[PDB]
Amino acid sequence: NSIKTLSNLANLLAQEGKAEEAIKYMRKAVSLDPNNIKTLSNLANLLAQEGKAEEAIKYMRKAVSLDPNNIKTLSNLAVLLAQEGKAEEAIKYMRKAVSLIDKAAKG
Amino acid sequence: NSIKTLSNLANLLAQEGKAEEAIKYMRKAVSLDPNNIKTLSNLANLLAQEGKAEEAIKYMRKAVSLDPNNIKTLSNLAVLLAQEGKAEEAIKYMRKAVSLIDKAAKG
């Protein structure tokens, strides 16, 4: 599993303060399967950690656009936006997740 | 960093379908610093993946109790509860996270 290996390598590089390299390997992981929401989310989180907030938000928004009713992706985007000082924007995404949980409760 | 090493080992064991072993090493990681919200959350997610839903929820609830205003922990607990068929319980946690984002927006 090349996505797995690249993701593991990126994690190890980031853990040890080589996150520019980590980002490169996570980008490669995305190219191997660009529709993988988990890879997209992992790259976004790494980007955010490294101060690339604009790009992180773009990637997390992409992950949402590819499955807009996913409460995990929605809440991750909300948390990312809030942490990046865009709480006003963040709240509509977390409210969407609430509404989807509410729908689930209703069945 | 023993928590790091144990967490890496657990990830590698789980990735390769030895998640009973992974859980043991994640439990060890928690014992090294039981107040670490990230370790607690990581163990909870692993537990949930392995069908130990009750225990996963306990650990994620603990992570929330140790920092009850953390929107990441709250939204993770909500997502976990929803995925485990407890959407009604899940919604109060995600609504709390919304309210905290709302407070943040207001400053």
Author numbering:
A (entry chain A), B (entry chain A): 1 to 107
Pull verbatim passages from the article behind this deposition.
The ﬁrst crystal structure of a TPR domain showed that the repeat units are helical hairpins, stacked into a continuous, right-handed superhelical architecture with an inner groove that mediates the interaction with target proteins. Here we show that such hairpins are detectable and that one of them, from the ribosomal protein RPS20, can be customized to yield a TPR fold by repetition, with only a small number of point mutations that are neutral for the parent organism.
M4NΔC is M4N without stop helix. We conclude that in the amplified constructs, the observed interactions are more favorable than the interaction with the native stop helix, releasing it and rendering it prone to degradation. This led us to ask whether this helix is in fact dispensable. Indeed, an M4NΔC construct, which terminates with the B3 helix, showed the same stability and dimerization as M4N. We obtained two structures for M4NΔC from different crystal forms at 2.0 Å and 1.7 Å resolution, respectively, the first (CF I) with two dimers in the ASU and the second (CF II) with a single chain in the ASU, for which we constructed the dimer by crystallographic symmetry. (a) Two dimers in the ASU of M4NΔC CF I. (b) Dimer constructed by applying the crystallographic symmetry to the single chain in the ASU of M4NΔC CF II. All three dimers superimpose to the M4N dimer with Cα RMSD below 1.9 Å.
